[PDB]
Amino acid sequence: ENEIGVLPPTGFFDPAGLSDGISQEKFDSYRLAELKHGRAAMLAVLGYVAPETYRFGYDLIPGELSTNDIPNGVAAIKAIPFGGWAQMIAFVGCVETYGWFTSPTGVLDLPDDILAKRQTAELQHGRLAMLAFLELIRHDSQNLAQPGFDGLDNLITGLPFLY
Amino acid sequence: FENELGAQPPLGFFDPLGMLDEAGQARFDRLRYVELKHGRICQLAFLGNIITRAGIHLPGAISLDGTKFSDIGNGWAGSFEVPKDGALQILFFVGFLELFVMKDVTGEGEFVGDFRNGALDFGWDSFSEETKLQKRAIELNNGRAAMMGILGLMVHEQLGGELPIVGQ
Amino acid sequence: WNEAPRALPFGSAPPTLDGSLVGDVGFDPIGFSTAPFASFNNPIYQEGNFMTDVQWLREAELTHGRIAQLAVVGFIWPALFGTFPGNENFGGADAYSYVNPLEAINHIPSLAIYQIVGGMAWVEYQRVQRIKEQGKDRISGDIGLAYPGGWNPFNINYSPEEYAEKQLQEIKHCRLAMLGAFGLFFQALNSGEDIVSQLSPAFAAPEYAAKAGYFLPQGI
Ligand code: CLA
Ligand code: CLA
Ligand code: CLA
Ligand code: CLA
Ligand SMILES: CC(=O)O[C@H]1CC(C)(C)C(=C=C/C(C)=C/C=C/C(C)=C/C=C/C=C(C)/C=C/C=C(\C)C(=O)C[C@@]23O[C@]2(C)C[C@@H](O)CC3(C)C)[C@](C)(O)C1
DSSP states (O other): OOOTTOOTTSSOOOSSOSSTTOOHHHHHHHHHHHHHHHHHHHHHHHHHHGGGTOOOOOOSSTTSOOGGGSOOSTTHHHHSOHHHHHHHHHHHHHHHHSOTTOOGGGSOOOOHHHHHHHHHHHHHHHHHHHHHHHHHHHHHHHHHHSTTSSSOOSSSSSOGGGO | OOSSTTOBTTTBSOOSSOOOSSOOSHHHHHHHHHHHHHHHHHHHHHHHHHHHHHTOOOSTTOBTTBOOGGGOOOHHHHTTTSOHHHHHHHHHHHHHHHTTTSSOOSOOOSSTTOOGGGTOOSOSSSSOHHHHHHHHHHHHHHHHHHHHHHHHHHHHHHHOOOOSSSOO | OEESOSSOTTSEEOTTOOSOSTTOOOOOSSOSSSSOTTTSSOSSOOTTTOOOHHHHHHHHHHHHHHHHHHHHHHHHHHHHSOOOSOOSSSOOSSTTTOOOTTTGGGSSOHHHHHHHHHHHHHHHHHHHHHHHHSTTOOOSSOTTOSSBTBOOTTOOOOOHHHHHHHHHHHHHHHHHHHHHHHHHHHHHHHHTSOHHHHHGGGGSOOTTTSOOOOOOOSOO
């Protein structure tokens, strides 16, 4: 009803009443899911732009398949073999399930008000990144399906100084 | 375990994985024994490899049906031309040595690996107390070195490239 | 958390800053000073023997700054002071003629690279030994250069106030050199040229814009 993540641009934004009564556990699970989807969206937005200008020269499949040649965007999933996707998914699962490659020194020792404001800002930035990723995916798919549709050319219609 | 030999200036004691932690004494002795054995094996392997790659090859190194010594190459790839039964005898000899004098047959236990077979001493009481520690530490240090480096000699042989000093 | 420190007067700083270390103005908006940054997975760690997280961060900052201070001069010197008189009877095939700093990396024999790596590894090992032995009492820096007590071929002596001002100058130049090395490297990468060939043209004129000359006859 009233917790972190309520800021004045609007105020509550629950039109369809997806929560209504629920419970503390269900609300906490929903908050965790929102934070996870938000962090994933922010990482996706950051990673959708970097390869346009920089490229690591590693040979996914030694001998050939060298990053320097695979397409960027939604066309990489077809080029990358299934083995690499499985390996990286298993790796991130090892990171998530266990404490491996994770350090509790990032929790920090911030005071209460600072922590609350920082959490609200984190949620806001992530909520923006979600729709950012949605728009990126829709533009990429529409352009790839039919070249010339949505005449704005190049990936990343903004930031035209890259090209 | 915090004052035993092998903990010296360039790092003092160094247990990053922390496998020791709680232990008795059998584990420490077993780890020391395996470290020393890997040592000895690796120094002899590296010395043989460097003396073979130097270019000095035995005349009587010739094998069955002539197979002149100049034909023998270097490395794992170059080793695939020596007789199979010759290396079978060689491995018989080494497993024999594993089941032979290389053991505390006498029953003397100055330190882990001090077999000495009570018969072939070259002078052991002559050295002072600090000299024994210095020699054991230098043997162990002159070991850890060999062990890792040789893995590289083995890694670099198959990886391919041009290492310094050694030609390749 | 203290409010309105020197620099960021409209922000705040964690209380871990305090005074003590030289060059502290209060710049710490994020954090990094309220976490165990020198004790969690430290293999050399030693309870009742290590320093404070802030001193560990100061050591890291000093290392990065020293490297950058050397790197700035390394970038600048060969461009305008000429290359080393080497390549004589060395069989380098103009390997030193290149001046583009990102081009000479692929023409230098591995002897120099491995010599440099080994020497700096030796210096780092000396630093590690000193850090391990000075326990929770490290004057910071260590490596025993020209200050009385360690190696001092020129016998440099200074009053404590001289030492404090020298420390302040060192840290200021370290930060400035970090910024300068970053800028120089990225400018060289972007323009494909060294700094001298990039600044020299913008000094007199382009050829297509300067006038033809003076052709009026004299004496008529
Ligand atoms: C047939 C001859 C023979 C016999 C009977 C022995 C007998 C023995 N050796 Mg031995 N050894 C021999 C030949 C022989 N050796 C040769 C030719 C070498 C090379 C020079 C060695 C090197 C060697 C070392 C270095 C050690 C022994 C040890 C031992 C003892 C315990 C071995 C054990 O637990 O089983 C072996 C059981 C295993 C499950 C093998 C373990 C394999 C390790 C963990 C990994 C191997 C990785 C592999 C090489 C690479 C894989 C391929 C790669 C692509 C990934 C035992 C007395 C050990 C010892 O004295 O401690 C008690 C010891 O530390 N030996
Ligand atoms: C949704 C996230 C996501 C996904 C699915 C991908 C997927 C892909 N990226 Mg990518 N990338 C991402 C985020 C992502 N990236 C981000 C955030 C960046 C900026 C750093 C990049 C930068 C990048 C480059 C420069 C390149 C790729 C490439 C690729 C492709 C080859 C696989 C690979 O090497 O991945 C690499 C994936 C990463 C490097 C992301 C790792 C991010 C994790 C979270 C960092 C974890 C912390 C880190 C270890 C340091 C810890 C310190 C502590 C303070 C945190 C593949 C399609 C390559 C390619 O050919 O693309 C066409 C390539 O050269 N990516
Ligand atoms: C020493 C460790 C090690 C070793 C030996 C390998 C070996 C290999 N990796 Mg690899 N990898 C590792 C660690 C390692 N990886 C780590 C730590 C990462 C970071 C996440 C990666 C990320 C990675 C990527 C991104 C890719 C590889 C690929 C490859 C293969 C090269 C091409 C090939 O042979 O195709 C032959 C391939 C096969 C015969 C199929 C192998 C299928 C894998 C082994 C199944 C993995 C299952 C997974 C781990 C657990 C189950 C799923 C999980 C959700 C429960 C090769 C088998 C490439 C590849 O697979 O291309 C095909 C590739 O694109 N690796
Ligand atoms: C790898 C093992 C190793 C180790 C531990 C040492 C250790 C040592 N060597 Mg040495 N050396 C080695 C290998 C090694 N060397 C090799 C392979 C050669 C060539 C055959 C030499 C040739 C050599 C000579 C000719 C001399 C030494 C000397 C010394 C001693 C003083 C070092 C010094 O003051 O330089 C410290 C140097 C620096 C700190 C320079 C660093 C400058 C900046 C920081 C470079 C930054 C590098 C950067 C981070 C890496 C990325 C760049 C890269 C892509 C190129 C020291 C005991 C000297 C001495 O008095 O001993 C007899 C001496 O005169 N060595
Ligand atoms: C102590 C230690 O060890 O580490 C510590 C370090 C530190 C920092 C303290 C820690 C932290 C917190 C973290 C990780 C903070 C990182 C936060 C981060 C990186 C947040 C990204 C936001 C991105 C957004 C909002 C993008 C919007 C994108 C938008 C709005 C777009 O429109 C995208 C766009 O594409 C469109 C749709 C159209 C295109 O034509 C144009 C562009 C490209 C513009 C940790 C976790 O405690 C660990």
